[PDB]
């Protein structure tokens, strides 16, 4: 027959994650000669991360993508990637290698299996930077007192509290309204998502904190995956791998465009000195011990090994 597979996600038009899933869609169609069709429900068409991944887990959707921080709703183990400053941009290829070809990726795959999901793409999303609507922020101490939107990650909540901020978990689709209404003073995200989602209209200041690393985890309902013929299973996984290579390749080009757009629209972007970054690293480091019982030590070590 034909097979139609629905894929929902929260990310904005033109965003690195979004474009990756457009490439996935194209590759699935090519490899199947049109027999398998991915229907894309991006940009919170069917809701934000949690609600659509819950639908994928239940089987009311075939596929969904959630940011890794929002995946904490489904397993605590994903929080390894939220630990503040567990990774930094300088080591990204070695992180990719461990996920793609190594033991780390196998462990992630097992986490997904344990919650009824088949991973198809570990999409790059990027490093979050703190941004504000009104308050000048240039240093760690300037973050104090800010009311800040978070994802659902317990670690993001704890990071904010350790920085002296007041964390406020808001779904992605509702975050712009909260900023516009003054419910929150700021947020932390990639400059690209912020620009693509047109948060840049309400923002005034940014710092290159890189205080959270996120992926966008594209998951298929495991029962649905296991129901498919083997040739279609292989199409999906091969398309995922090829789409991931493509999506990583365009990510930093798009990030550069967004940083330029921030500039153009008058947002002040402060580059932290080594000293000021080290303060942030240490101020957030106590969060790690608060989650030692929820994140396997072996998994922390596999991630840290990528940064050596």
Author numbering: 29 to 336
Quoted from the paper:
O. alaskensis employs a tripartite ATP-independent periplasmic (TRAP) transporter (OaIsePQM) to import isethionate, which relies on the substrate-binding protein (OaIseP) to scavenge isethionate and deliver it to the membrane transporter component (OaIseQM) for import into the cell.
To define the molecular details of substrate-binding, we determined the isethionate-bound structure of OaIseP. OaIseP purified in 5 mM isethionate produced crystals that diffracted to 1.25 Å. The asymmetric unit for isethionate-bound OaIseP contained two monomers that are bridged by water molecules, where domains I and II of each monomer interact with domains II and I of the opposing monomer. We used Proteins, Interfaces, Structures and Assemblies (PISA) to assess the nature of the interface between chains A and B, calculating the size of the buried area to be 624 Å2, with a Complexation Significance Score of 0, which suggested that the formation of this assembly was not likely. Isethionate is bound in the cleft between domain I and domain II, with a closer examination of the isethionate-binding site revealing several key contacts made by OaIseP. The sulfonate moiety of isethionate forms salt bridges with Arg156 and Arg177, as well as forming hydrogen bonds with Ser95, Asn98, Tyr153, and Asn217. At the opposing end of isethionate, hydrogen bonds are formed with Asn77 and His244 via the terminal hydroxyl group. No water molecules directly contact isethionate, and the binding site is lined with Pro38, Met39 and Leu221, with Trp200 occupying the bottom of the site, providing a large hydrophobic surface for the hydrocarbon backbone of isethionate. Aligning the open ligand-free and closed isethionate-bound structures gives an r.m.s.d. of 2.7 Å over all 308 pairs of α-carbons.
